[PDB]
């Protein structure tokens, strides 16, 4: 069936509740003190992590070479815990997937799992009026409150939930090359 065991292990060790002025989001920690959150969360220079106020040391809203929103923001956080390194679970390329799980960790839903079915490489999405690329699509009625939710299949962390129209759900891709270790003035 769906990979519930895999999704649970990712939730246990690699998720936190993140809270900005836009609300609460599931936040996936990727490695060391680096995590991801939907760009719509509007991260500033501090963020609440599990209700603890935390300095945001770096924040990078990803865009592609067309200067189009990818809806992923990568954050570096000032906190003592290191995240388990899950980069080796990230896909190398764009792909479609079978029988994925969407996993939420918020104050309202401290852990909840939703089998979303098949996931297709959707591409372009007008996301609440912002053009966005690299989007994954599932036919599941996802809802407000699930943004940031982790999308997995066994062995792979493939996206974070960012949108939905009452019939389909949409995730922003996570690619392995987003998190590899030059000299760049990026602000
Ligand atoms: C998650 C965030 C949340 O709860 O509110 C953030 C303040 C939310 C999940 C969806 C809400 C309804 N169902 C969901 O799964 N994400 C959003 O609200 C983004 C906006 C949307 O999802 C819109 N949907 C679409 O634009 C759309 C287009 C198509 C083909 O299908 N759906 C609304 C109709 C909900 C938030 C967002 C992200 C990026 C932006 F630039 C603007 C807004």
Automatic annotation (TrEMBL):
Residues 1-179 form the Peptidase C3 domain. It is found in: Host cytoplasmic vesicle membrane; Host nucleus; Virion. It comes from the Viruses. RNA-directed RNA polymerase: Replicates the viral genomic RNA on the surface of intracellular membranes. May form linear arrays of subunits that propagate along a strong head-to-tail interaction called interface-I. Covalently attaches UMP to a tyrosine of VPg, which is used to prime RNA synthesis. The positive stranded RNA genome is first replicated at virus induced membranous vesicles, creating a dsRNA genomic replication form. This dsRNA is then used as template to synthesize positive stranded RNA genomes. ss(+)RNA genomes are either translated, replicated or encapsidated. Belongs to the picornaviruses polyprotein family. Interacts with protein 3CD. This is Genome polyprotein.
């Amino acid at each position: 069936g769906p990979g519930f065991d895999f999704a649970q292990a990712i939730m246990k060790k690699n998720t936190v509740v993140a809270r900005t002025e836009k609300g609460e989001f599931t936040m996936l920690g990727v490695h060391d003190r680096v995590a991801v959150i939907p760009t719509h969360a509007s991260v500033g220079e501090t963020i609440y992590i599990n209700d603890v106020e935390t300095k945001v040391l770096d924040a990078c809203a990803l865009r592609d070479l067309t200067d189009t929103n990818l809806e992923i923001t990568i954050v570096k956080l000032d906190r003592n815990q290191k995240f388990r390194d899950i980069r080796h679970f990230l896909p190398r390329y764009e792909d479609d997937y079978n029988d994925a799980v969407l996993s939420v960790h918020t104050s309202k839903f401290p852990n909840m799992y939703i089998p979303v079915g098949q996931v297709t490489n959707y591409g372009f999405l007008n996301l609440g009026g912002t053009p966005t690329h690299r989007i994954l699509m599932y036919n599941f009625p996802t809802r407000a409150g699930q943004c940031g939710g982790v999308v997995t299949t066994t062995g792979k962390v493939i996206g974070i939930h960012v949108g939905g129209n009452g019939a389909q759900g949409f995730a922003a891709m996570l690619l392995h090359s987003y998190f590899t270790d030059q000299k760049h003035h990026h602000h």
